[PDB]
Amino acid sequence: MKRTYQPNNRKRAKTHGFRARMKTKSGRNILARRRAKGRHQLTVSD
Amino acid sequence: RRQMTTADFSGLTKKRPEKALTEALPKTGGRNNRGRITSRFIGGGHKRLYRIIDFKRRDKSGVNAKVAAIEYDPNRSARIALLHYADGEKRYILAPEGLTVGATVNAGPEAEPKLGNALPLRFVPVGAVVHALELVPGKGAQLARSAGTSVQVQGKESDYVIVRLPSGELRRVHSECYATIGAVGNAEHKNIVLGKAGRSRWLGRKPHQRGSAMNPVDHPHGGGEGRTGAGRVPVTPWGKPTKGLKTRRKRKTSDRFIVT
RNA sequence: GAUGUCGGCUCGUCGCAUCCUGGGGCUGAAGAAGGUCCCAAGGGUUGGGCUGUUCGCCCAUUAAAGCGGCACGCGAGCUG
RNA sequence: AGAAACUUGGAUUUCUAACCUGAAAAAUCACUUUCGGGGACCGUGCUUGGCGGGUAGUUUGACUGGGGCGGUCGCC
RNA sequence: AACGAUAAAAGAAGUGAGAAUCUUCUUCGCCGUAAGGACAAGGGUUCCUGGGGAAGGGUCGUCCGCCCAGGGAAAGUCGGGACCUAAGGUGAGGCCGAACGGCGCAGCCGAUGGACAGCAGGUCAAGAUUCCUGCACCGAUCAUGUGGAGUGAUGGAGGGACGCAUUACGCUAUCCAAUGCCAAGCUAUGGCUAUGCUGGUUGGUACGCUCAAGGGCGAUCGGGUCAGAAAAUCUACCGGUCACAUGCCUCAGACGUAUCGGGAGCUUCCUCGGAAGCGAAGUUGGAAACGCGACGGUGCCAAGAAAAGCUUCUAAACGUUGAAACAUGAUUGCCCGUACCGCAAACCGACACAGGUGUCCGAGUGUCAAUGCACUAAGGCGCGCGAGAGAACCCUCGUUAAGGAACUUUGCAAUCUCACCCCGUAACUUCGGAAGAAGGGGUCCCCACGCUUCGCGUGGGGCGCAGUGAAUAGGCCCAGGCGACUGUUUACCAAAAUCACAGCACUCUGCCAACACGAACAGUGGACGUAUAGGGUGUGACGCCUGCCCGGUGCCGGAAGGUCAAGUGGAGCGGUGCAAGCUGCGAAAUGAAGCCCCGGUGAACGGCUAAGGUAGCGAAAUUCCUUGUCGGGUAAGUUCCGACCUGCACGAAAGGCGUAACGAUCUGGGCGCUGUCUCAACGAGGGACUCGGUGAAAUUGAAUUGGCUGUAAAGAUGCGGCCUACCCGUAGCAGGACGAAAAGACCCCGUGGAGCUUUACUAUAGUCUGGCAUUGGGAU
RNA sequence: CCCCCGUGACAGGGGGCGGAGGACCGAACCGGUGCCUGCUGAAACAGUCUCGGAUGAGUUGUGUUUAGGAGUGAAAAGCU
RNA sequence: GAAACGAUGACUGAAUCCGCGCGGACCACCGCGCAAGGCUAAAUACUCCCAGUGACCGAUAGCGCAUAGUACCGUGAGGG
Numbered sequence A: 001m002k003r004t005y006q007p008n009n010r011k012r013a014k015t016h017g018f019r020a021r022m023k024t025k026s027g028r029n030i031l032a033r034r035r036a037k038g039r040h041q042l043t044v045s046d
Numbered sequence B: 001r002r003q004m005t006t007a008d009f010s011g012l013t014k015k016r017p018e019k020a021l022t023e024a025l026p027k028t029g030g031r032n033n034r035g036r037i038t039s040r041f042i043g044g045g046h047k048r049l050y051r052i053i054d055f056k057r058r059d060k061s062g063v064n065a066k067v068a069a070i071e072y073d074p075n076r077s078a079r080i081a082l083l084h085y086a087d088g089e090k091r092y093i094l095a096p097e098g099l100t101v102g103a104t105v106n107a108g109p110e111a112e113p114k115l116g117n118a119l120p121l122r123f124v125p126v127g128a129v130v131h132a133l134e135l136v137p138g139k140g141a142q143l144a145r146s147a148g149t150s151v152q153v154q155g156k157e158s159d160y161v162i163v164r165l166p167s168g169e170l171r172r173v174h175s176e177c178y179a180t181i182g183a184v185g186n187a188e189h190k191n192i193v194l195g196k197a198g199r200s201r202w203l204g205r206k207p208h209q210r211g212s213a214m215n216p217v218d219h220p221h222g223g224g225e226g227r228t229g230a231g232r233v234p235v236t237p238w239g240k241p242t243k244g245l246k247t248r249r250k251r252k253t254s255d256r257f258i259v260t
Numbered sequence C: 001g002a003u004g005u006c007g008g009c010u011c012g013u014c015g016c017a018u019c020c021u022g023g024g025g026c027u028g029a030a031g032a033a034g035g036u037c038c039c040a041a042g043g044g045u046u047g048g049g050c051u052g053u054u055c056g057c058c059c060a061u062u063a064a065a066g067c068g069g070c071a072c073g074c075g076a077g078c079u080g
Numbered sequence D: 001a002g003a004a005a006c007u008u009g010g011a012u013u014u015c016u017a018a019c020c021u022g023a024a025a026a027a028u029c030a031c032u033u034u035c036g037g038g039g040a041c042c043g044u045g046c047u048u049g050g051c052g053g054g055u056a057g058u059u060u061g062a063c064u065g066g067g068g069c070g071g072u073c074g075c076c
Numbered sequence E: 001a002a003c004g005a006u007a008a009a010a011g012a013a014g015u016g017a018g019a020a021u022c023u024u025c026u027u028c029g030c031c032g033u034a035a036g037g038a039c040a041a042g043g044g045u046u047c048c049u050g051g052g053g054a055a056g057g058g059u060c061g062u063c064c065g066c067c068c069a070g071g072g073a074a075a076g077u078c079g080g081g082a083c084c085u086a087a088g089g090u091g092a093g094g095c096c097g098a099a100c101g102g103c104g105c106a107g108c109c110g111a112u113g114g115a116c117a118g119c120a121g122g123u124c125a126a127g128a129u130u131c132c133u134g135c136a137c138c139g140a141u142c143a144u145g146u147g148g149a150g151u152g153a154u155g156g157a158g159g160g161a162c163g164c165a166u167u168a169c170g171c172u173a174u175c176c177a178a179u180g181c182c183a184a185g186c187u188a189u190g191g192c193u194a195u196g197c198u199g200g201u202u203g204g205u206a207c208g209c210u211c212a213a214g215g216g217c218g219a220u221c222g223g224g225u226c227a228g229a230a231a232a233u234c235u236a237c238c239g240g241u242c243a244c245a246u247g248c249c250u251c252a253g254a255c256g257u258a259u260c261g262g263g264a265g266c267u268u269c270c271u272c273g274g275a276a277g278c279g280a281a282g283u284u285g286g287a288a289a290c291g292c293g294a295c296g297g298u299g300c301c302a303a304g305a306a307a308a309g310c311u312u313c314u315a316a317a318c319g320u321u322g323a324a325a326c327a328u329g330a331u332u333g334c335c336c337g338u339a340c341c342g343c344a345a346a347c348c349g350a351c352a353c354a355g356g357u358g359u360c361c362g363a364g365u366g367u368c369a370a371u372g373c374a375c376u377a378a379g380g381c382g383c384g385c386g387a388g389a390g391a392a393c394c395c396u397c398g399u400u401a402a403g404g405a406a407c408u409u410u411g412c413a414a415u416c417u418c419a420c421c422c423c424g425u426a427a428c429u430u431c432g433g434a435a436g437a438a439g440g441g442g443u444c445c446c447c448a449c450g451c452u453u454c455g456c457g458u459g460g461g462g463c464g465c466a467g468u469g470a471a472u473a474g475g476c477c478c479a480g481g482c483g484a485c486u487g488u489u490u491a492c493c494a495a496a497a498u499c500a501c502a503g504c505a506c507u508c509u510g511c512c513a514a515c516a517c518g519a520a521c522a523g524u525g526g527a528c529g530u531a532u533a534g535g536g537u538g539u540g541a542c543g544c545c546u547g548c549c550c551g552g553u554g555c556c557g558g559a560a561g562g563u564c565a566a567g568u569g570g571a572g573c574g575g576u577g578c579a580a581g582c583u584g585c586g587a588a589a590u591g592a593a594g595c596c597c598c599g600g601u602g603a604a605c606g607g608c609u610a611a612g613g614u615a616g617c618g619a620a621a622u623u624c625c626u627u628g629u630c631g632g633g634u635a636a637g638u639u640c641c642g643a644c645c646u647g648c649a650c651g652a653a654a655g656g657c658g659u660a661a662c663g664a665u666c667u668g669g670g671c672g673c674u675g676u677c678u679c680a681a682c683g684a685g686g687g688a689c690u691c692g693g694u695g696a697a698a699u700u701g702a703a704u705u706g707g708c709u710g711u712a713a714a715g716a717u718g719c720g721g722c723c724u725a726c727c728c729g730u731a732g733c734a735g736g737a738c739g740a741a742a743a744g745a746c747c748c749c750g751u752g753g754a755g756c757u758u759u760a761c762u763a764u765a766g767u768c769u770g771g772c773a774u775u776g777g778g779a780u
Numbered sequence F: 001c002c003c004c005c006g007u008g009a010c011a012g013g014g015g016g017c018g019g020a021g022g023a024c025c026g027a028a029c030c031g032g033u034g035c036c037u038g039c040u041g042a043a044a045c046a047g048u049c050u051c052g053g054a055u056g057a058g059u060u061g062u063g064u065u066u067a068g069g070a071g072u073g074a075a076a077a078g079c080u
Numbered sequence G: 001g002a003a004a005c006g007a008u009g010a011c012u013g014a015a016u017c018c019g020c021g022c023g024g025a026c027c028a029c030c031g032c033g034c035a036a037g038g039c040u041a042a043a044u045a046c047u048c049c050c051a052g053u054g055a056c057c058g059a060u061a062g063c064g065c066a067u068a069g070u071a072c073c074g075u076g077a078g079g080g
């Protein structure tokens, strides 16, 4: 039973990363939306 | 001829001589552009490289050459002939039927109508049979590079020569284009029986998949209980038999009696 | 806002319009073997071939190889 | 009733400065080009009509001794 | 109910408030191509020390991967960065786009790969090509001296540089044998007194005329300018010369000497346990890699990265008295990762989860071989509930009288069968196969002889019920239906007669190809392919073959006429004003594809009034009547095989009829063999039961919850009459409580939905076509 | 490829050698044939036994590309 | 629709003061206006934030929160 989650550092950093949210504005949208979300923690500190 | 095999579940092969392996670009396999898959299948292969090969053969004009070896390379389906010139420059060309190893090949407008020689159509004799023809002066040869193919000469116009393309189509090709004497040898590919399933794979991926296997979602022929279908059409409902897919164009008046 | 449905297997139990066995009347019942009707439900009612089949056909038997009910008895018992 | 002449239009034909377009040391480009070919077409912009399950939105009645099928919907 | 695998544990000893569980000893069973060891990913102090006992641990707990605190992780050389590039990402300029944005040459990023300087040991409680000891090596800056003169670029060239299978030779790791060498000692049980027993038996560096299989290299003069943009002494060439086998170059690895290590043990001290000191021999014989020598050899078709470092050559520049090169000291080595887990108690799975996870090493004995099988070494572990009982039932195994498929939907299941050697082996056949067809026989131990190696054959002899003596280990055959075949498919009820498949056919496409993605005269895929190509379609090896009918539908071709849009054109009609004039509608002709119309096309949809079945086949995967009728087998045969023809409703590439081989396919039969069965029995183990510890769940109107008859919304414990019945439990069984579970998936209803289809409606991408625009000139 | 034998329409036949394959048997590994056990189970798809492929259309790591009327699909309306 | 007028996408493309646009097809009168050039607080909207009050809540209310977008769930967006 190979599970859905197969942790890869360089992956979770390539997709989802702050630098990753940089390239597009859907992700910068996500950023500011998250900042106001309460003080959440945006992806790559987690 | 061809190679054959005793009964182990087999038929044919080809026969390849003159071994070298020399000096050319890599290439990668892929089936599509920025998006999803365009041209269906052919995602397999033996990881061929590419041999940049001269077609136009202009700048070697006036300079003779000797055939070095004849190597059989993919992305071609033709014999590749190696050339060495008097310049010291080596170059690749296609290898017409019956070209021995180490004959003499010369380019230019002055050249003699012998095997492998490059020279424009205006000099090409009446009824002669040649391959590797440009549609336009310069660029390269888009005509008669394939398996066992050739094009003959049907007459002259002004700048134009009437040529016979190997669908059996008559066309007007101007005499300002270079051409290469002879038919591309290629043995005969129609011979080789391509073995069994996966002999495909050797050169390219999983072949025809019948839309009638598919489902209404997938293709038109899809759906139903049984083996059948009604209205006869492709991915998009154009249809295969006898529908001209051509458009009204420029070279269309540079074309005469296309029938078949 | 659920009463699982054919057939089998397992377990039974019940009715009698009785297939056997028991008691009788009549007989176109000499005897033997029967045909029919009346009383009788204690017990008994075989093994195989084909078919998913109950039914049915056939093999070899037998005192006989009974008919129905029990949600066409039985899946919180089995099969499927 | 001949025609010099500016001619406004349609038809085949031809030309080259538009435009497309390949070669050359300068790979996509731009450049000067010898240029080479195509060329008033093709492309593309507006409009015109056709075609168009490829796609898209929807329609597909009721009665009915369950529904369907058959039948029946008004009037005397 | 359970406490998460049936790999069992036992005693003593210790500690403590308390021990089945923590510590130690001694035994026991278990893995050992692992259940040992090393890494990667990922986890994040889980490591070590000293504590701790709440919770976490399926019981316990003095214990732990839990809690607290402290410590521990060292690099010029290993892996990465300061180097290079692949897919991909990116991208000034550049090409597009209602926006946000999509592209894109160079360049750049990007290891999974290229390049690149050390090895051997020691050791803290916890690090080691990192620290220390021994001896290395690389680049850099500079100093004495040699030389005593050229260095020789973002540019050229060379080279990096690459497949698969198979294989000759030499060697090592490494393992095996021994009356080799060394060391220690005693050994009794009946013997052995060593010829027994146990353990150990070279790693690095250096020189050396030693030994060595294997491995790859031609050298210089010169010529043409047209070749490497230019240059050149470098490279590519055509030529001349000397080189055929000797020849050169390097030596994996062995040998000797040296030397630094290590080494069985050994001695001393012991804070009760480790420290510290010492140190023997290193042989002969055999086996042996997927590693090394190497970029080896031969063959094959599908024809097997790039780029830097690097080697040579010039351009430019500075210098040609103080160059490049060498060794000879010195100085110099920046950044990040190194603990621990890492086939799992620490990663992904809520869990201390029977699952999952890529690479490396993986010993010995027996066995043709082996990573197989059994047992074992080093190493690791007995699975964090126990203990008793020996009922039903349940699971997993063992044996079975007589019978042997009578069981059943079906031999489902489970036997039988089994390895290697010898002999032997059918129809049919694509001459490969069928085949391991079918059968039959051998198998152990000792002795002599022989032999081509482990061993093997021959002869003789011995033992047992039996000698692949235990483990690994095909039952077989005769007929068919389907598909040819290997293969592929429904992650979680369907592996097939599906899909694919080689082969065959129709058709499209002349190359900014048709065709497909796309806000787009961008770009890209087809393809760096070009008409024995590329697309779409349908058939499905192979063999014999593929018939009749185009009326209707699509499709290509045609041209007499019919109909038709915008538009060009404008007869005429009207409003208004005194008019000039401004204005509402408006025809005839002329105007394109298009459809009607003529023809043709079926391996185009399609048919058996367009004709209506050519072969081949037929009660078939199509057959209704139907268990059709004869036969075959059977004691009996609704299935199966064969034959007939009345084919309800076979039939020729939605292919027809055949076919050897193949098949975890489907169907019928036989042999073999069996607990499938008559008909069950005994035996084992794991649950079930009992005691101590931890302790859930679905369900639940409330219940103080019987039977038969009846009655009620038509199936009564709860209504009636009659019967039965002391209170409460435990092990059991499954009839009832219309028992539980999911607001039935069937069915109907809803002017509820969504997928799909089309000659239902409607729009539209797309595409075609007339006009106008870019868009201009002349002959005519 | 090297030797022995055979061409009356007939082919190649025996030996030596070589190492071919969508060849065989079979562990890894990849896969799921049949029965049983299991039914919040050890497990939200397994376990034992049996079975299939086992040099090929093979298996697998890393980096990456493709997606909602959309992708992907040796084609179940499967997978995303 | 009798559809005027503003507004552009494509073809077209006038006047200029005895002139031009309008007044809901259009005409004439009659009026109203002078386009193709730009800027221009104020009165209007909103509440991250500060103050004041309330026939607003008072711990299942009141914001999600008597502070936490934390724990916790998800690859993520997101939820909480």
Ligand SMILES: [Mg+2]
Binding pocket: B212, B213, B214, B215
């Ligand atoms: Mg289908």
Ligand SMILES: [Mg+2]
Binding pocket: B216, B217, B219, B220
């Ligand atoms: Mg469709």
Ligand SMILES: [Mg+2]
Binding pocket: B220, B221, B222, B223, B224, B228, B229, B230
């Ligand atoms: Mg269809």
Ligand SMILES: [Mg+2]
Binding pocket: none
């Ligand atoms: Mg019943």
Ligand SMILES: [Mg+2]
Binding pocket: none
């Ligand atoms: Mg109705």
Ligand SMILES: [Mg+2]
Binding pocket: none
């Ligand atoms: Mg346990």
Ligand SMILES: [Mg+2]
Binding pocket: E008, E009, E029, E382
């Ligand atoms: Mg044990």
Ligand SMILES: [Mg+2]
Binding pocket: none
């Ligand atoms: Mg063992």
Ligand SMILES: [Mg+2]
Binding pocket: none
């Ligand atoms: Mg506890």
Ligand SMILES: [Mg+2]
Binding pocket: none
């Ligand atoms: Mg010894």
Ligand SMILES: [Mg+2]
Binding pocket: E352
């Ligand atoms: Mg455990």
Ligand SMILES: [Mg+2]
Binding pocket: none
């Ligand atoms: Mg072993």
Ligand SMILES: [Mg+2]
Binding pocket: E400
């Ligand atoms: Mg028996």
Ligand SMILES: [Mg+2]
Binding pocket: none
């Ligand atoms: Mg017996």
Ligand SMILES: [Mg+2]
Binding pocket: none
């Ligand atoms: Mg039977």
Ligand SMILES: [Mg+2]
Binding pocket: none
């Ligand atoms: Mg029976």
